[PDB]
Structures are given as C-alpha cells and as structure tokens.
C-alpha cells in the first residue's frame, strides 16, 4: 500500500470554462479589442473546475487529446463570425498586432484553427506536439513553456448585429466554452496555493 511507483493516471472528463462576451460597437474600437478570450489551456488554468483541482494533486500533465467546445446561448438571427485557435507557444502574443486582417491571418495560419458563427457550435482541437514533453501544473512561473501546453485565443471577426441593421453596443454574452479533455498526470504531489 506504500508503492513508490510513478504511473500516468490517464483520465477523461469535461469542464465548464467561461461564458464568452462578444464585444459589440462601444468597446470594440481597435484590433486587440477583438480578442474576446486569452485563456491558457493548462490543466490548472480553471480554478473552480475539476481538471484544475485534479492537476493540483500532480506535478505534470500532457493533453493526449483535448478539445474546446463552444455552445451558443443566442438565436440564429444574430450573426457574427468567430475564429478560434490554440497556439502551442504560450509566448507568441498577437496583442502587439495593429492590423486586424494580419491578426486573423496569423490565426488562420495556425494548424488547429477553426472559424464559425456564434449561433452554431463547433470544436477547437488541441494539436499535441511530438517530443513526448510533459508540462507542470502549478501556477505559471518564471517561464510559461514549462507549464502551458497551449493558449486558446477567441477572436471577433465581424460586428455584432441583430434582426434589424441595429448594431448592438452593450457587449452581451453569446455562448459558453467547454473543455472535453483527456490527460495523464504523472507524479503525485500537492501544489501550493
């Protein structure tokens, strides 16, 4: 009962991430205002969830096949495109970019990217690397490539509009993000908090 073995506990689940908020007209005045979400996809990036709670009890992890899932809380009469991707490089930051088309193009350039209307649902996969690398669970520290396996950027391509030509201006909620994940944690521990 005192086994000193280190074994990967591959285990599945699903978790509620966040309610996304498309920006509208008032707040959306520049390009970086079109980045609705900047959410690391490290196991321990979602405090109240189950994945993060488990992560807290291990050193490491590796998404074997993760996926972000968008569920719309709006009707179809509203129309606005969204582009979502997961940069495997936690440091690559598009916030510095000024041109909107440049940002959407460097988004669509990523391999696991998707586009969709905020009235339907899709799935944003995570493309896992090839060098068997593991990542740490604790709160992000000196460097981020040790901890984060990816960073999910959610983008606003169009302007939020409704039944009529009316352009909404109140920055209202469009849907909800869900993570359908599978990862294996290696070394039992407790991470501080």
């Amino acid at each position: 009962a005192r086994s000193d073995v280190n074994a990967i506990t591959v285990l599945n689940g699903s978790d509620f991430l966040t309610t996304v908020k498309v920006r509208g007209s008032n707040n959306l005045i520049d390009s970086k205002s079109r980045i609705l979400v900047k959410q690391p996809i490290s196991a321990s990036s979602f405090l109240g969830t189950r994945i993060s709670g488990l992560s807290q009890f291990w050193e490491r992890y590796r998404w074997h096949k993760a996926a972000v899932r968008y569920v719309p809380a709006v009707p179809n009469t509203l129309a606005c495109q969204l582009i979502g991707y997961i940069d495997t490089d936690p440091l690559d930051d598009p916030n510095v970019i000024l041109d909107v088309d440049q940002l959407l193009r460097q988004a669509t350039s990523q391999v696991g990217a998707r586009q969709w209307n905020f009235s339907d649902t899709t799935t944003i996969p995570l493309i896992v690397r090839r060098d068997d690398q593991l990542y740490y669970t604790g709160q992000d520290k000196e460097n981020v490539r040790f901890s984060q396996q990816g960073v999910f950027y959610l983008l606003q391509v169009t302007t939020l509009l409704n039944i009529s030509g009316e352009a909404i201006t109140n920055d209202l909620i469009s849907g909800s993000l869900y993570l359908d994940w599978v990862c294996g944690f290696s070394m039992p521990q407790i991470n501080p908090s």
Binding site: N76, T77, A79, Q115, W116, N117, S119, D120
Partner: peptide, 21 residues
C-alpha cells in the same frame, strides 16, 4: 393526343435562415 401541349413544371427550394459554414 398532341403531346407536351402546355407543360409546366414545379420545383421547390427551401430558404432557411443563417446558412452556416
């Protein structure tokens, strides 16, 4: 039995909202 005197043809086409891609 003059065939095809005044023939007419009907063909529908659904018009849904928000055809998504």
């Amino acid at each position: 039995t003059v065939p095809n005197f005044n023939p007419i043809v009907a063909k529908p086409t659904v018009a849904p909202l928000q055809t998504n891609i």
